[PDB]
Amino acid sequence: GNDFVSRLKALDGREGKIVSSYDDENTGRCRLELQKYELEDGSQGLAVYLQDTGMYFTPSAGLDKETKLKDANTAVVSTSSERPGGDACGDFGGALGYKKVLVLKDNQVTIRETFRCVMDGFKKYDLSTTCQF
C-alpha cells in the first residue's frame, strides 16, 4: 500500500519507452503523470496516466478507497467497464469479468485490462500497455 504509492510517485513526471502495447500505433514514448482527484462521495483519489504515447485511449488508472493489491506490485483499480451506453466491449455491453490492474515493478508501469465479451462468443481480451522508466 504505502510502498506501492511511494514507488509510483517516485516515477511521476519521468519519461520512458513503450515496451509493449495492444495499440501498435503509438509514439514509442511514455510519460507517467499523476493527478489528484475527488470522488463523488468527496473521497480522495490518485489518477495515473501514461501520457505522450499517441494512443487514442490514454492508459489510465484510478487509485482510490476501492483499490486492493493483488500482490505487492499489482493493484486492482477497476472491476467494471460500465459506461453510459456500453462497456469495454463497445455498444450493447457484454463485458464479463472485467478487471483493470496497475502493475509497478522493475521501473515499469503496466496498465492491463482483461475481460470477455458475451455478445461476441465470450472472446477473451487482454489489452495492456507497459512503459519502461
mmCIF file of N, CA and C in Angstrom:
data_model
loop_
_atom_site.group_PDB
_atom_site.id
_atom_site.type_symbol
_atom_site.label_atom_id
_atom_site.label_comp_id
_atom_site.label_asym_id
_atom_site.label_seq_id
_atom_site.Cartn_x
_atom_site.Cartn_y
_atom_site.Cartn_z
ATOM 1 N N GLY A 1 0.795 -1.213 0.000
ATOM 2 C CA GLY A 1 0.000 0.000 0.000
ATOM 3 C C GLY A 1 0.833 1.271 0.000
ATOM 4 N N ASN A 2 1.454 1.571 1.146
ATOM 5 C CA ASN A 2 2.285 2.768 1.242
ATOM 6 C C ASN A 2 3.478 2.690 0.300
ATOM 7 N N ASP A 3 4.167 1.544 0.270
ATOM 8 C CA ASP A 3 5.301 1.407 -0.635
ATOM 9 C C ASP A 3 4.862 1.491 -2.094
ATOM 10 N N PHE A 4 3.722 0.883 -2.439
ATOM 11 C CA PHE A 4 3.247 0.937 -3.822
ATOM 12 C C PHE A 4 3.073 2.381 -4.269
ATOM 13 N N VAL A 5 2.338 3.169 -3.481
ATOM 14 C CA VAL A 5 2.102 4.564 -3.844
ATOM 15 C C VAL A 5 3.409 5.345 -3.872
ATOM 16 N N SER A 6 4.275 5.129 -2.878
ATOM 17 C CA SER A 6 5.557 5.826 -2.862
ATOM 18 C C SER A 6 6.370 5.515 -4.110
ATOM 19 N N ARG A 7 6.425 4.236 -4.499
ATOM 20 C CA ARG A 7 7.163 3.879 -5.705
ATOM 21 C C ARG A 7 6.532 4.505 -6.936
ATOM 22 N N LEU A 8 5.209 4.636 -6.938
ATOM 23 C CA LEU A 8 4.527 5.247 -8.063
ATOM 24 C C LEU A 8 4.872 6.724 -8.165
ATOM 25 N N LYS A 9 4.769 7.448 -7.046
ATOM 26 C CA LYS A 9 5.098 8.871 -7.055
ATOM 27 C C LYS A 9 6.564 9.113 -7.394
ATOM 28 N N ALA A 10 7.428 8.140 -7.095
ATOM 29 C CA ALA A 10 8.833 8.255 -7.459
ATOM 30 C C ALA A 10 9.042 8.291 -8.965
ATOM 31 N N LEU A 11 8.109 7.748 -9.746
ATOM 32 C CA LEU A 11 8.214 7.773 -11.198
ATOM 33 C C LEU A 11 7.438 8.921 -11.833
ATOM 34 N N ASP A 12 6.676 9.672 -11.036
ATOM 35 C CA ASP A 12 5.870 10.777 -11.546
ATOM 36 C C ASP A 12 6.721 11.755 -12.341
ATOM 37 N N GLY A 13 6.254 12.085 -13.543
ATOM 38 C CA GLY A 13 6.951 13.008 -14.410
ATOM 39 C C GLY A 13 8.059 12.408 -15.244
ATOM 40 N N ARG A 14 8.448 11.163 -14.985
ATOM 41 C CA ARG A 14 9.552 10.560 -15.705
ATOM 42 C C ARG A 14 9.132 10.172 -17.113
ATOM 43 N N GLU A 15 10.095 10.220 -18.023
ATOM 44 C CA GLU A 15 9.886 9.836 -19.407
ATOM 45 C C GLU A 15 10.470 8.453 -19.625
ATOM 46 N N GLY A 16 9.720 7.621 -20.330
ATOM 47 C CA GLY A 16 10.129 6.256 -20.569
ATOM 48 C C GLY A 16 9.835 5.827 -21.985
ATOM 49 N N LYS A 17 10.011 4.543 -22.259
ATOM 50 C CA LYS A 17 9.749 3.991 -23.573
ATOM 51 C C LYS A 17 8.672 2.930 -23.459
ATOM 52 N N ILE A 18 7.833 2.849 -24.483
ATOM 53 C CA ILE A 18 6.786 1.836 -24.508
ATOM 54 C C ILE A 18 7.433 0.501 -24.824
ATOM 55 N N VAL A 19 7.355 -0.431 -23.870
ATOM 56 C CA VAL A 19 7.865 -1.784 -24.061
ATOM 57 C C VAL A 19 6.917 -2.579 -24.929
ATOM 58 N N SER A 20 5.629 -2.461 -24.654
ATOM 59 C CA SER A 20 4.619 -3.187 -25.390
ATOM 60 C C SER A 20 3.311 -2.448 -25.235
ATOM 61 N N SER A 21 2.452 -2.630 -26.220
ATOM 62 C CA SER A 21 1.100 -2.121 -26.142
ATOM 63 C C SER A 21 0.202 -2.909 -27.078
ATOM 64 N N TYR A 22 -1.041 -3.111 -26.650
ATOM 65 C CA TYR A 22 -2.062 -3.626 -27.551
ATOM 66 C C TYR A 22 -2.256 -2.718 -28.748
ATOM 67 N N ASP A 23 -1.874 -1.447 -28.630
ATOM 68 C CA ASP A 23 -2.099 -0.454 -29.674
ATOM 69 C C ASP A 23 -0.760 -0.188 -30.348
ATOM 70 N N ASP A 24 -0.572 -0.769 -31.536
ATOM 71 C CA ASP A 24 0.687 -0.635 -32.257
ATOM 72 C C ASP A 24 0.901 0.761 -32.832
ATOM 73 N N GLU A 25 -0.113 1.624 -32.812
ATOM 74 C CA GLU A 25 0.015 2.973 -33.360
ATOM 75 C C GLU A 25 0.275 3.940 -32.210
ATOM 76 N N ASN A 26 1.543 4.012 -31.820
ATOM 77 C CA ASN A 26 1.956 4.827 -30.693
ATOM 78 C C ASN A 26 3.298 5.461 -31.025
ATOM 79 N N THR A 27 3.730 6.379 -30.167
ATOM 80 C CA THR A 27 4.962 7.126 -30.367
ATOM 81 C C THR A 27 6.207 6.360 -29.944
ATOM 82 N N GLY A 28 6.049 5.225 -29.272
ATOM 83 C CA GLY A 28 7.162 4.579 -28.622
ATOM 84 C C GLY A 28 7.587 5.217 -27.321
ATOM 85 N N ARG A 29 7.004 6.354 -26.942
ATOM 86 C CA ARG A 29 7.391 7.090 -25.749
ATOM 87 C C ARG A 29 6.221 7.136 -24.777
ATOM 88 N N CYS A 30 6.541 7.392 -23.516
ATOM 89 C CA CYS A 30 5.510 7.424 -22.494
ATOM 90 C C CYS A 30 6.029 8.205 -21.304
ATOM 91 N N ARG A 31 5.128 8.965 -20.702
ATOM 92 C CA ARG A 31 5.459 9.772 -19.544
ATOM 93 C C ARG A 31 4.424 9.499 -18.468
ATOM 94 N N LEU A 32 4.884 9.197 -17.258
ATOM 95 C CA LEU A 32 3.962 8.979 -16.153
ATOM 96 C C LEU A 32 3.464 10.323 -15.628
ATOM 97 N N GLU A 33 2.148 10.462 -15.510
ATOM 98 C CA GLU A 33 1.543 11.666 -14.942
ATOM 99 C C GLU A 33 0.552 11.257 -13.874
ATOM 100 N N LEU A 34 0.739 11.759 -12.659
ATOM 101 C CA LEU A 34 -0.200 11.522 -11.576
ATOM 102 C C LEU A 34 -0.989 12.793 -11.323
ATOM 103 N N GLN A 35 -2.257 12.636 -10.963
ATOM 104 C CA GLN A 35 -3.100 13.795 -10.697
ATOM 105 C C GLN A 35 -4.095 13.442 -9.609
ATOM 106 N N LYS A 36 -4.151 14.269 -8.567
ATOM 107 C CA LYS A 36 -5.154 14.072 -7.532
ATOM 108 C C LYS A 36 -6.538 14.393 -8.084
ATOM 109 N N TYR A 37 -7.541 13.662 -7.603
ATOM 110 C CA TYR A 37 -8.919 13.983 -7.942
ATOM 111 C C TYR A 37 -9.822 13.661 -6.760
ATOM 112 N N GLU A 38 -11.054 14.150 -6.845
ATOM 113 C CA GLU A 38 -12.051 13.997 -5.796
ATOM 114 C C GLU A 38 -13.150 13.063 -6.282
ATOM 115 N N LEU A 39 -13.452 12.040 -5.484
ATOM 116 C CA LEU A 39 -14.536 11.125 -5.809
ATOM 117 C C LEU A 39 -15.883 11.737 -5.429
ATOM 118 N N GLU A 40 -16.952 11.156 -5.976
ATOM 119 C CA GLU A 40 -18.269 11.768 -5.827
ATOM 120 C C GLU A 40 -18.716 11.805 -4.372
ATOM 121 N N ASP A 41 -18.259 10.860 -3.554
ATOM 122 C CA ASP A 41 -18.514 10.903 -2.122
ATOM 123 C C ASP A 41 -17.547 11.819 -1.385
ATOM 124 N N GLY A 42 -16.872 12.716 -2.103
ATOM 125 C CA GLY A 42 -15.854 13.556 -1.507
ATOM 126 C C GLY A 42 -14.562 12.850 -1.173
ATOM 127 N N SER A 43 -14.354 11.640 -1.687
ATOM 128 C CA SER A 43 -13.157 10.871 -1.379
ATOM 129 C C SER A 43 -11.989 11.313 -2.254
ATOM 130 N N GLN A 44 -10.779 11.077 -1.755
ATOM 131 C CA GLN A 44 -9.560 11.457 -2.454
ATOM 132 C C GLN A 44 -9.066 10.295 -3.307
ATOM 133 N N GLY A 45 -8.749 10.584 -4.570
ATOM 134 C CA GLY A 45 -8.216 9.581 -5.463
ATOM 135 C C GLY A 45 -6.943 10.069 -6.124
ATOM 136 N N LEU A 46 -6.212 9.121 -6.709
ATOM 137 C CA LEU A 46 -4.976 9.421 -7.420
ATOM 138 C C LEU A 46 -5.090 8.814 -8.811
ATOM 139 N N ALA A 47 -5.140 9.671 -9.826
ATOM 140 C CA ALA A 47 -5.230 9.233 -11.213
ATOM 141 C C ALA A 47 -3.825 9.036 -11.765
ATOM 142 N N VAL A 48 -3.656 7.971 -12.539
ATOM 143 C CA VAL A 48 -2.372 7.573 -13.101
ATOM 144 C C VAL A 48 -2.550 7.516 -14.603
ATOM 145 N N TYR A 49 -1.720 8.239 -15.328
ATOM 146 C CA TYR A 49 -1.801 8.274 -16.774
ATOM 147 C C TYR A 49 -0.454 7.974 -17.395
ATOM 148 N N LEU A 50 -0.475 7.265 -18.505
ATOM 149 C CA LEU A 50 0.682 7.181 -19.378
ATOM 150 C C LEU A 50 0.441 8.159 -20.513
ATOM 151 N N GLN A 51 1.147 9.284 -20.472
ATOM 152 C CA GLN A 51 0.975 10.345 -21.455
ATOM 153 C C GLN A 51 2.009 10.233 -22.562
ATOM 154 N N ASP A 52 1.796 11.002 -23.625
ATOM 155 C CA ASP A 52 2.747 11.142 -24.724
ATOM 156 C C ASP A 52 2.861 9.884 -25.576
ATOM 157 N N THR A 53 1.948 8.918 -25.419
ATOM 158 C CA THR A 53 2.015 7.680 -26.183
ATOM 159 C C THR A 53 1.431 7.799 -27.578
ATOM 160 N N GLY A 54 0.683 8.852 -27.856
ATOM 161 C CA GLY A 54 -0.029 8.897 -29.115
ATOM 162 C C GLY A 54 -1.204 7.957 -29.239
ATOM 163 N N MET A 55 -1.551 7.226 -28.185
ATOM 164 C CA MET A 55 -2.634 6.268 -28.259
ATOM 165 C C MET A 55 -3.982 6.971 -28.150
ATOM 166 N N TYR A 56 -4.965 6.455 -28.887
ATOM 167 C CA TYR A 56 -6.288 7.058 -28.818
ATOM 168 C C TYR A 56 -6.886 6.910 -27.428
ATOM 169 N N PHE A 57 -6.673 5.762 -26.785
ATOM 170 C CA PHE A 57 -7.088 5.562 -25.400
ATOM 171 C C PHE A 57 -5.859 5.739 -24.511
ATOM 172 N N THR A 58 -5.836 6.816 -23.741
ATOM 173 C CA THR A 58 -4.758 7.057 -22.783
ATOM 174 C C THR A 58 -4.754 5.954 -21.738
ATOM 175 N N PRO A 59 -3.651 5.232 -21.554
ATOM 176 C CA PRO A 59 -3.598 4.298 -20.429
ATOM 177 C C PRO A 59 -3.843 5.055 -19.135
ATOM 178 N N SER A 60 -4.795 4.570 -18.348
ATOM 179 C CA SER A 60 -5.206 5.300 -17.163
ATOM 180 C C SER A 60 -5.587 4.336 -16.053
ATOM 181 N N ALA A 61 -5.392 4.777 -14.816
ATOM 182 C CA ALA A 61 -5.839 4.003 -13.677
ATOM 183 C C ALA A 61 -6.224 4.959 -12.563
ATOM 184 N N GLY A 62 -7.248 4.591 -11.809
ATOM 185 C CA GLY A 62 -7.656 5.397 -10.679
ATOM 186 C C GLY A 62 -7.453 4.668 -9.372
ATOM 187 N N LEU A 63 -6.598 5.210 -8.517
ATOM 188 C CA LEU A 63 -6.359 4.657 -7.197
ATOM 189 C C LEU A 63 -7.292 5.322 -6.201
ATOM 190 N N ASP A 64 -8.012 4.513 -5.432
ATOM 191 C CA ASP A 64 -8.997 5.087 -4.523
ATOM 192 C C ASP A 64 -9.222 4.118 -3.365
ATOM 193 N N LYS A 65 -10.309 4.348 -2.623
ATOM 194 C CA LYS A 65 -10.648 3.506 -1.483
ATOM 195 C C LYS A 65 -10.950 2.078 -1.906
ATOM 196 N N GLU A 66 -11.403 1.885 -3.145
ATOM 197 C CA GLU A 66 -11.754 0.568 -3.658
ATOM 198 C C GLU A 66 -10.545 -0.234 -4.103
ATOM 199 N N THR A 67 -9.377 0.390 -4.174
ATOM 200 C CA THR A 67 -8.218 -0.286 -4.731
ATOM 201 C C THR A 67 -7.684 -1.326 -3.757
ATOM 202 N N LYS A 68 -7.416 -2.520 -4.268
ATOM 203 C CA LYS A 68 -6.826 -3.588 -3.484
ATOM 204 C C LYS A 68 -5.597 -4.106 -4.204
ATOM 205 N N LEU A 69 -4.581 -4.485 -3.435
ATOM 206 C CA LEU A 69 -3.417 -5.121 -4.028
ATOM 207 C C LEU A 69 -3.692 -6.599 -4.260
ATOM 208 N N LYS A 70 -3.403 -7.065 -5.473
ATOM 209 C CA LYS A 70 -3.420 -8.490 -5.767
ATOM 210 C C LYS A 70 -2.124 -9.149 -5.325
ATOM 211 N N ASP A 71 -1.006 -8.456 -5.502
ATOM 212 C CA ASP A 71 0.257 -8.782 -4.852
ATOM 213 C C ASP A 71 0.971 -7.462 -4.584
ATOM 214 N N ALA A 72 2.203 -7.545 -4.086
ATOM 215 C CA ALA A 72 2.905 -6.336 -3.679
ATOM 216 C C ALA A 72 3.055 -5.349 -4.827
ATOM 217 N N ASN A 73 3.058 -5.828 -6.064
ATOM 218 C CA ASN A 73 3.338 -4.947 -7.194
ATOM 219 C C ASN A 73 2.131 -4.678 -8.076
ATOM 220 N N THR A 74 0.946 -5.168 -7.721
ATOM 221 C CA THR A 74 -0.197 -5.199 -8.630
ATOM 222 C C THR A 74 -1.432 -4.713 -7.896
ATOM 223 N N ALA A 75 -2.012 -3.610 -8.368
ATOM 224 C CA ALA A 75 -3.221 -3.045 -7.790
ATOM 225 C C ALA A 75 -4.388 -3.307 -8.723
ATOM 226 N N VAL A 76 -5.504 -3.756 -8.165
ATOM 227 C CA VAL A 76 -6.735 -3.895 -8.933
ATOM 228 C C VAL A 76 -7.436 -2.554 -8.851
ATOM 229 N N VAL A 77 -7.536 -1.861 -9.983
ATOM 230 C CA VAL A 77 -8.014 -0.483 -9.985
ATOM 231 C C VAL A 77 -9.382 -0.338 -10.603
ATOM 232 N N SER A 78 -9.918 -1.378 -11.213
ATOM 233 C CA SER A 78 -11.292 -1.290 -11.672
ATOM 234 C C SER A 78 -11.834 -2.691 -11.805
ATOM 235 N N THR A 79 -13.100 -2.863 -11.427
ATOM 236 C CA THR A 79 -13.773 -4.128 -11.681
ATOM 237 C C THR A 79 -15.039 -3.932 -12.505
ATOM 238 N N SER A 80 -15.178 -2.802 -13.193
ATOM 239 C CA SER A 80 -16.321 -2.620 -14.077
ATOM 240 C C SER A 80 -15.936 -1.648 -15.175
ATOM 241 N N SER A 81 -16.345 -1.960 -16.406
ATOM 242 C CA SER A 81 -16.125 -1.063 -17.531
ATOM 243 C C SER A 81 -17.414 -0.381 -17.966
ATOM 244 N N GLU A 82 -18.430 -0.396 -17.108
ATOM 245 C CA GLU A 82 -19.759 0.067 -17.476
ATOM 246 C C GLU A 82 -19.765 1.577 -17.643
ATOM 247 N N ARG A 83 -20.092 2.021 -18.850
ATOM 248 C CA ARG A 83 -20.234 3.428 -19.182
ATOM 249 C C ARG A 83 -21.675 3.684 -19.602
ATOM 250 N N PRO A 84 -22.101 4.936 -19.693
ATOM 251 C CA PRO A 84 -23.400 5.211 -20.315
ATOM 252 C C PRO A 84 -23.422 4.718 -21.754
ATOM 253 N N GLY A 85 -24.168 3.647 -22.008
ATOM 254 C CA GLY A 85 -24.349 3.143 -23.351
ATOM 255 C C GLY A 85 -23.460 1.990 -23.761
ATOM 256 N N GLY A 86 -22.753 1.367 -22.828
ATOM 257 C CA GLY A 86 -21.927 0.226 -23.175
ATOM 258 C C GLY A 86 -20.841 0.012 -22.137
ATOM 259 N N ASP A 87 -19.819 -0.730 -22.549
ATOM 260 C CA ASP A 87 -18.703 -1.045 -21.671
ATOM 261 C C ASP A 87 -17.487 -1.362 -22.537
ATOM 262 N N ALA A 88 -16.524 -2.090 -21.970
ATOM 263 C CA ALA A 88 -15.279 -2.382 -22.672
ATOM 264 C C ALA A 88 -15.507 -3.102 -23.995
ATOM 265 N N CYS A 89 -16.643 -3.785 -24.150
ATOM 266 C CA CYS A 89 -16.993 -4.488 -25.377
ATOM 267 C C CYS A 89 -17.681 -3.590 -26.389
ATOM 268 N N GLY A 90 -17.732 -2.290 -26.126
ATOM 269 C CA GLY A 90 -18.387 -1.352 -27.017
ATOM 270 C C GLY A 90 -19.858 -1.176 -26.692
ATOM 271 N N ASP A 91 -20.593 -0.692 -27.688
ATOM 272 C CA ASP A 91 -22.037 -0.609 -27.569
ATOM 273 C C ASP A 91 -22.612 -1.989 -27.272
ATOM 274 N N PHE A 92 -23.827 -1.999 -26.734
ATOM 275 C CA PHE A 92 -24.563 -3.215 -26.404
ATOM 276 C C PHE A 92 -23.988 -3.928 -25.185
ATOM 277 N N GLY A 93 -22.906 -3.423 -24.599
ATOM 278 C CA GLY A 93 -22.341 -4.025 -23.408
ATOM 279 C C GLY A 93 -21.829 -5.431 -23.661
ATOM 280 N N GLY A 94 -21.911 -6.258 -22.626
ATOM 281 C CA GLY A 94 -21.489 -7.637 -22.717
ATOM 282 C C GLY A 94 -20.130 -7.953 -22.133
ATOM 283 N N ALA A 95 -19.485 -6.999 -21.459
ATOM 284 C CA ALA A 95 -18.189 -7.251 -20.842
ATOM 285 C C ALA A 95 -18.367 -8.125 -19.611
ATOM 286 N N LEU A 96 -17.587 -9.189 -19.528
ATOM 287 C CA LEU A 96 -17.740 -10.163 -18.463
ATOM 288 C C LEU A 96 -16.400 -10.380 -17.775
ATOM 289 N N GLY A 97 -16.400 -10.266 -16.450
ATOM 290 C CA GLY A 97 -15.191 -10.464 -15.687
ATOM 291 C C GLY A 97 -14.180 -9.353 -15.845
ATOM 292 N N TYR A 98 -14.625 -8.164 -16.237
ATOM 293 C CA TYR A 98 -13.688 -7.073 -16.495
ATOM 294 C C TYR A 98 -12.855 -6.744 -15.262
ATOM 295 N N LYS A 99 -11.555 -6.581 -15.477
ATOM 296 C CA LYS A 99 -10.633 -6.202 -14.419
ATOM 297 C C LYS A 99 -9.570 -5.319 -15.042
ATOM 298 N N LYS A 100 -9.243 -4.206 -14.394
ATOM 299 C CA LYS A 100 -8.074 -3.418 -14.785
ATOM 300 C C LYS A 100 -7.076 -3.448 -13.645
ATOM 301 N N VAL A 101 -5.818 -3.718 -13.966
ATOM 302 C CA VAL A 101 -4.782 -3.709 -12.948
ATOM 303 C C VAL A 101 -3.712 -2.709 -13.340
ATOM 304 N N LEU A 102 -3.030 -2.208 -12.324
ATOM 305 C CA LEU A 102 -1.874 -1.337 -12.469
ATOM 306 C C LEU A 102 -0.704 -2.087 -11.855
ATOM 307 N N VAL A 103 0.289 -2.410 -12.670
ATOM 308 C CA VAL A 103 1.457 -3.165 -12.208
ATOM 309 C C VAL A 103 2.648 -2.229 -12.155
ATOM 310 N N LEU A 104 3.377 -2.271 -11.049
ATOM 311 C CA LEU A 104 4.515 -1.400 -10.818
ATOM 312 C C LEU A 104 5.659 -2.265 -10.319
ATOM 313 N N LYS A 105 6.637 -2.501 -11.185
ATOM 314 C CA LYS A 105 7.785 -3.316 -10.802
ATOM 315 C C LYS A 105 8.868 -3.095 -11.836
ATOM 316 N N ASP A 106 10.123 -3.248 -11.422
ATOM 317 C CA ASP A 106 11.226 -3.192 -12.379
ATOM 318 C C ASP A 106 11.285 -1.858 -13.113
ATOM 319 N N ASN A 107 10.831 -0.797 -12.442
ATOM 320 C CA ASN A 107 10.750 0.545 -13.023
ATOM 321 C C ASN A 107 9.889 0.564 -14.276
ATOM 322 N N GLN A 108 8.943 -0.363 -14.353
ATOM 323 C CA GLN A 108 7.948 -0.396 -15.406
ATOM 324 C C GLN A 108 6.580 -0.144 -14.799
ATOM 325 N N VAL A 109 5.745 0.544 -15.554
ATOM 326 C CA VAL A 109 4.339 0.699 -15.221
ATOM 327 C C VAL A 109 3.536 0.012 -16.300
ATOM 328 N N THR A 110 2.650 -0.884 -15.895
ATOM 329 C CA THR A 110 1.754 -1.549 -16.830
ATOM 330 C C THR A 110 0.330 -1.286 -16.400
ATOM 331 N N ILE A 111 -0.526 -0.938 -17.354
ATOM 332 C CA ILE A 111 -1.966 -0.933 -17.150
ATOM 333 C C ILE A 111 -2.553 -2.016 -18.033
ATOM 334 N N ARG A 112 -3.249 -2.956 -17.401
ATOM 335 C CA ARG A 112 -3.758 -4.123 -18.153
ATOM 336 C C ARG A 112 -5.241 -4.345 -17.868
ATOM 337 N N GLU A 113 -6.011 -4.454 -18.944
ATOM 338 C CA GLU A 113 -7.439 -4.731 -18.889
ATOM 339 C C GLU A 113 -7.695 -6.120 -19.442
ATOM 340 N N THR A 114 -8.464 -6.906 -18.706
ATOM 341 C CA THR A 114 -8.821 -8.252 -19.134
ATOM 342 C C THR A 114 -10.323 -8.405 -18.998
ATOM 343 N N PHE A 115 -10.948 -9.052 -19.977
ATOM 344 C CA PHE A 115 -12.394 -9.242 -19.946
ATOM 345 C C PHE A 115 -12.770 -10.166 -21.091
ATOM 346 N N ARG A 116 -13.985 -10.687 -21.013
ATOM 347 C CA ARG A 116 -14.581 -11.454 -22.091
ATOM 348 C C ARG A 116 -15.794 -10.698 -22.602
ATOM 349 N N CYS A 117 -16.159 -10.946 -23.857
ATOM 350 C CA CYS A 117 -17.269 -10.231 -24.480
ATOM 351 C C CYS A 117 -18.361 -11.233 -24.836
ATOM 352 N N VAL A 118 -19.499 -11.109 -24.155
ATOM 353 C CA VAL A 118 -20.589 -12.075 -24.290
ATOM 354 C C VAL A 118 -21.138 -12.072 -25.711
ATOM 355 N N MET A 119 -21.632 -10.920 -26.162
ATOM 356 C CA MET A 119 -22.258 -10.788 -27.473
ATOM 357 C C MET A 119 -21.239 -10.954 -28.596
ATOM 358 N N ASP A 120 -20.137 -11.650 -28.316
ATOM 359 C CA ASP A 120 -19.138 -11.964 -29.331
ATOM 360 C C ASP A 120 -18.429 -13.266 -28.975
ATOM 361 N N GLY A 121 -19.203 -14.280 -28.594
ATOM 362 C CA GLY A 121 -18.654 -15.600 -28.361
ATOM 363 C C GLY A 121 -17.764 -15.734 -27.150
ATOM 364 N N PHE A 122 -17.876 -14.824 -26.180
ATOM 365 C CA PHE A 122 -17.059 -14.864 -24.964
ATOM 366 C C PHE A 122 -15.569 -14.753 -25.283
ATOM 367 N N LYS A 123 -15.254 -14.095 -26.399
ATOM 368 C CA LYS A 123 -13.870 -13.831 -26.767
ATOM 369 C C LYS A 123 -13.146 -13.140 -25.620
ATOM 370 N N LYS A 124 -11.920 -13.580 -25.356
ATOM 371 C CA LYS A 124 -11.111 -13.012 -24.288
ATOM 372 C C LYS A 124 -10.250 -11.877 -24.830
ATOM 373 N N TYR A 125 -10.208 -10.769 -24.094
ATOM 374 C CA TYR A 125 -9.361 -9.632 -24.421
ATOM 375 C C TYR A 125 -8.360 -9.416 -23.293
ATOM 376 N N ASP A 126 -7.131 -9.070 -23.660
ATOM 377 C CA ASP A 126 -6.052 -8.847 -22.695
ATOM 378 C C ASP A 126 -5.330 -7.686 -23.367
ATOM 379 N N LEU A 127 -5.612 -6.478 -22.898
ATOM 380 C CA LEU A 127 -5.093 -5.269 -23.522
ATOM 381 C C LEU A 127 -4.262 -4.528 -22.491
ATOM 382 N N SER A 128 -2.960 -4.432 -22.730
ATOM 383 C CA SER A 128 -2.082 -3.800 -21.766
ATOM 384 C C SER A 128 -1.127 -2.869 -22.480
ATOM 385 N N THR A 129 -0.628 -1.902 -21.729
ATOM 386 C CA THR A 129 0.461 -1.041 -22.164
ATOM 387 C C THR A 129 1.491 -1.013 -21.059
ATOM 388 N N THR A 130 2.753 -1.205 -21.421
ATOM 389 C CA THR A 130 3.834 -1.213 -20.448
ATOM 390 C C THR A 130 4.848 -0.154 -20.826
ATOM 391 N N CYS A 131 5.206 0.673 -19.860
ATOM 392 C CA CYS A 131 6.171 1.758 -20.019
ATOM 393 C C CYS A 131 7.394 1.457 -19.159
ATOM 394 N N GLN A 132 8.592 1.507 -19.756
ATOM 395 C CA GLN A 132 9.841 1.289 -19.033
ATOM 396 C C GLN A 132 10.476 2.631 -18.720
ATOM 397 N N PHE A 133 10.667 2.905 -17.437
ATOM 398 C CA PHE A 133 11.397 4.085 -16.994
ATOM 399 C C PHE A 133 12.804 3.693 -16.558
#
